[PDB]
Amino acid sequence: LSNISMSSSEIIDVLCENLNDGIWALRVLYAEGAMNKEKLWDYINQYHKDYQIENEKDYEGKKILPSRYALDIMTARLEGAGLISFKAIGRVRIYDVTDLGNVLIKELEKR
Amino acid sequence: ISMSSSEIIDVLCENLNDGIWALRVLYAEGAMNKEKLWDYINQYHKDYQIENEGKKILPSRYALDIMTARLEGAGLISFKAIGRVRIYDVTDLGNVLIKELEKRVEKNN
Numbered sequence: 001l002s003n004i005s006m007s008s009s010e011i012i013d014v015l016c017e018n019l020n021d022g023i024w025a026l027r028v029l030y031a032e033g034a035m036n037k038e039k040l041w042d043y044i045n046q047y048h049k050d051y052q053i054e055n056e057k058d059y060e061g062k063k064i065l066p067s068r069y070a071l072d073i074m075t076a077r078l079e080g081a082g083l084i085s086f087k088a089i090g091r092v093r094i095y096d097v098t099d100l101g102n103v104l105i106k107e108l109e110k111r
Numbered sequence: 112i113s114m115s116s117s118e119i120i121d122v123l124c125e126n127l128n129d130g131i132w133a134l135r136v137l138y139a140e141g142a143m144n145k146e147k148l149w150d151y152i153n154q155y156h157k158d159y160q161i162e163n164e165g166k167k168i169l170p171s172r173y174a175l176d177i178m179t180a181r182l183e184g185a186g187l188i189s190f191k192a193i194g195r196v197r198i199y200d201v202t203d204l205g206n207v208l209i210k211e212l213e214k215r216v217e218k219n220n
Contacts, residue, residue: 004116014186073180080181082122103112
């Protein structure tokens with residue numbers, strides 16, 4: 001009766017445009033593999049920090065994730081977009097990139 | 112790669128959860144600032160519940176920011192910053208999900 005009114009690439013473009021800083025969680029998970037949310041918090045801060053230092057060797061800025069509140073917001077954006085997902089180990093959450101998240105990492109670099 | 116519009120939308124639908132309330136509010140009431148959205152989301156959900164209680168779906172600003180974050184990331188709502196104020200509205204993709212959910216309500220009933 002009615003097709004989905006936006007193409008796969010138009011939808012992917014919207015997800016790419018709102019990814020913003022979440023790209024750091026994707027880079028971490030893509031390079032390091034699945035990880036505990038707590039460790040992902042640390043790695044995202046380290047990846048971002050090192051990337052800033054690559055450009056400004058005397059860089060000394062604030063953590064992109066200074067609080068659990070910030071961590072929860074960043075993962076919330078990625079979970080809502082279906083780019084990362086998690087599995088439970090008791091109260092621990094193990095995160096990894098999803099198929100759409102991978103579909104998106106490619107679509108990113110290329111463009 | 113190789114994901115159809117349908118496959119992608121399925122993924123967005125599976126992760127929407129309670130965010131549907133914000134899409135419904137924005138669609139019905141039109142664009143509004145974030146503080147009003149918070150009130151309306153609670154008011155909308157409250158009413159739905161009242162006739163189906165007590166607890167606010169968004170009891171704190173934290174809950175409000177987590178819910179809107181999931182929606183913004185999925186590209187379902189969008190906002191314009193004016194100073195520290197933000198005016199939100201539901202997007203084309205947000206309406207695609209509203210329509211997709213109504214299609215499912217239709218099939219599941």
